[PDB]
Amino acid sequence: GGRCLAFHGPLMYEHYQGWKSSWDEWVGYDRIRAYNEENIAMKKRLALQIPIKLKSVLVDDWEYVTKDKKICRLPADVTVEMVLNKYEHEVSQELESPGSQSQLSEYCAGLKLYFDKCLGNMLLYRLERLQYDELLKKSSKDQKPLVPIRIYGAIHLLRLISVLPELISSTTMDLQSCQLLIKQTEDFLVWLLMHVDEY
Amino acid sequence: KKIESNFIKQNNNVKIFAKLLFNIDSHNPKQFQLPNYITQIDENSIKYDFFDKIYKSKMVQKRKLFQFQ
Amino acid sequence: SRGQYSDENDKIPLTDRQLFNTSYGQSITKLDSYNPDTHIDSNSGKFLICYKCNQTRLGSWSHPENSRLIMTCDYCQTPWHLDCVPRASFKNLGSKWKCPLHSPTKVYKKINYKVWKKQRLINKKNQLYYEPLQKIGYQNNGNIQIIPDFKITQIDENSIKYDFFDKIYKSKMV
């Protein structure tokens, strides 16, 4: 199909066109088009925001990170694995439409992967920056990778889902993807509306 | 040539947002602020995933036929 | 020739050699005499197996009546019997013979109606722009291509079968 599809320099392929049969080769190597190497080097050089539903918690923990940082225990007993695993057990069975739960499940996997490396880039204040530095220092004594899943609570999770939509538009992407992201954001906030005890 | 095109051939379970993961080093971090307004192995993995989700679909089908009564 | 529209749907007009001076045994169509050359392709020499019934049905020279006419496709070269799909004879002049397995150019769903006369075809340059980012719930109204503005997203098998299953799980409650 088409009129120009060649791994090497194109010669209106639909074999080296315009040459004799004693030049063919079908070896398997790397293939780059490069538009006939820039036309044989130019002929040899010429010859969006969150809804107002429960926005009190962000201004609640905005002041509380100045001197308390919303966490005082390094091995925090609050963890994200159970609160993320309960999503497939309470709401995906109830609120999601009949069909596939992928829009929650692969979201959970992707957000875990995002939380695996979100540290060091935004989402951080100076004193818990020092806390993360000392956590990395105590985690480097056994040359093990730092897992931020067992040592970080869910207090920064909703602040993360608050900061991401503004940076979502920073890259080139379609608009209904952002519509799906704000739909997931409102779903998460109606999930956490009456879950005021867990943080 | 753009880096992201061959990045999706080895990344799994991250589908919704992939373009923002490339330029994580092109933007410098800053302090906290707030506005005043406020494929073979991966193929087997996704087949096993799909099997899990249609099984979950079977129990949710049982769930709506149970709660319909 | 005179300045009319002609996409790939129209077949190239036949030359007079195949049209007037095509002997007496051949005739315009294979509808007469035994023609076993139509059941064997010159590309590989194998037998054209019909898609609907898995039979070449070449028949016999002693019993010509058991021979079933077959034709190759003008797009995918898929063999097809003349008795399986409802059709009297071959397709030699006019539009190219589109086998009943391809996407129609225009479909009709009644809710007045929407035509969706495809999206034509864009040549390989900067206007033909691709973006794979989402597989689930895209609502991209078709016009796709399979991989292992007039944008065409890189759709794969997994996403198509996923959103098909998702839609038929939405629609069965109705």
How is residue C19 annotated by DSSP? H
CA distance linking residue A165 with residue A49, whole number of Å = 7
CA distance linking residue C57 with residue C69, whole number of Å = 8
Q: In terms of C-beta density within 10 A (0-12 exposed, 13-18 middle, 19 or more buried), how is residue A179 classed?
A: exposed
Tokens of C165: 């299953």
Tokens of C142: 């078709």
- A23 found inside a domain: no
CA distance linking residue C19 with residue A12, whole number of Å = 32
Taking contacts as CB-CB distances below 8 angstroms, the residues of chain A near B38 are 49-50, 55, 58-59, 162
**Residues 93-112, chain A, touching C (beta carbon < 8 A):** 97-100, 102-103
Interrupted after residues, chain C (C–N over 2.5 Å): 111, 148
B54 touches chain C (CB under 8 A): yes
Taking contacts as CB-CB distances below 8 angstroms, the residues of chain B near A120 are 29
- A35 found inside a domain: no
Could you tell me if C112 and A153 are in contact, meaning their C-beta atoms sit under 8 angstroms apart? no
Q: Can you give C84-117 as a three-state secondary structure string? A: CCCCCCCCCCCECCCCCCCCCCCCCEECCEECCC
Tokens of A101: 């739960």
Could you tell me if C133 and B19 are in contact, meaning their C-beta atoms sit under 8 angstroms apart? yes
Pairing of strands C154-155, C145-146: parallel
Could you tell me if A153 and A73 are in contact, meaning their C-beta atoms sit under 8 angstroms apart? no
With CA atoms as reference, the chain B residue closest to C134 would be B16
Could you tell me if C152 and C143 are in contact, meaning their C-beta atoms sit under 8 angstroms apart? yes
Q: In terms of C-beta density within 10 A (0-12 exposed, 13-18 middle, 19 or more buried), how is residue A83 classed?
A: middle
Could you tell me if C41 and C35 are in contact, meaning their C-beta atoms sit under 8 angstroms apart? no
What's chain B's length in residues? 69
- A76 found inside a domain: yes
Tell if the CB–CB gap between A2 and C170 is shorter than 8 Å. Answer: no
CA distance linking residue B26 with residue B31, whole number of Å = 17
DSSP assignment of A8-61: SS-SS----TTS-STT----------HHHHHHHHHHHHH--PPPSSSTHHHHHH
Q: What is the phi/psi pair of residue A45, to 5°?
A: 55, 45
Tokens of A184: 């997931």
- A100 found inside a domain: yes
Domain of A118 in residue numbering reads as: 48-199
Question: Which of A102, A171, A175, A179 would you mutate first to test chain C, the one with the most C CBs within 10 A?
Answer: A102
Taking contacts as CB-CB distances below 8 angstroms, the residues of chain A near B56 are 88, 92, 101
Residue with tokens 């410098």: B28
DSSP assignment of B5-36: GGTTTT--S--S--HHHHTTSSS--------S
Taking contacts as CB-CB distances below 8 angstroms, the residues of chain C near B50 are 158, 162
How is residue C146 annotated by DSSP? E
Could you tell me if A61 and A156 are in contact, meaning their C-beta atoms sit under 8 angstroms apart? no
Taking contacts as CB-CB distances below 8 angstroms, the residues of chain A near B49 are 105-106
- A8 found inside a domain: no
Question: Between the CA of residue A164 and those of A50, A123, B68, C49, what are the distances in Å?
Answer: 11, 10, 39, 56
Residue with tokens 């088009």: A33
Paired strand residues for C146: C155
- A73 found inside a domain: yes
DSSP assignment of A113-133: HHHTT-TTSSS--HHHHHHHH
Q: What's the number of domains chain A is made of?
A: 1
Task: Write the CB contacts of C11 (distance below 8 Å, at least 6 apart in sequence).
Answer: C74, C91, C92, C93, C94, C95, C96, C97
CA distance A97 to chain C (A): 7
CA distance linking residue C92 with residue A48, whole number of Å = 58
Residues C107-138 as b or e (16 or more Cβ within 10 Å = b):
eeeeeeeeeeeeeeeeeeeeeeeeebbbbebb
- A24 found inside a domain: no
CA distance C98 to chain A (A): 16
Tell if the CB–CB gap between C134 and B15 is shorter than 8 Å. Answer: yes
Paired strand residues for C47: C40
CA distance A142 to chain B (A): 27
- A199 found inside a domain: yes
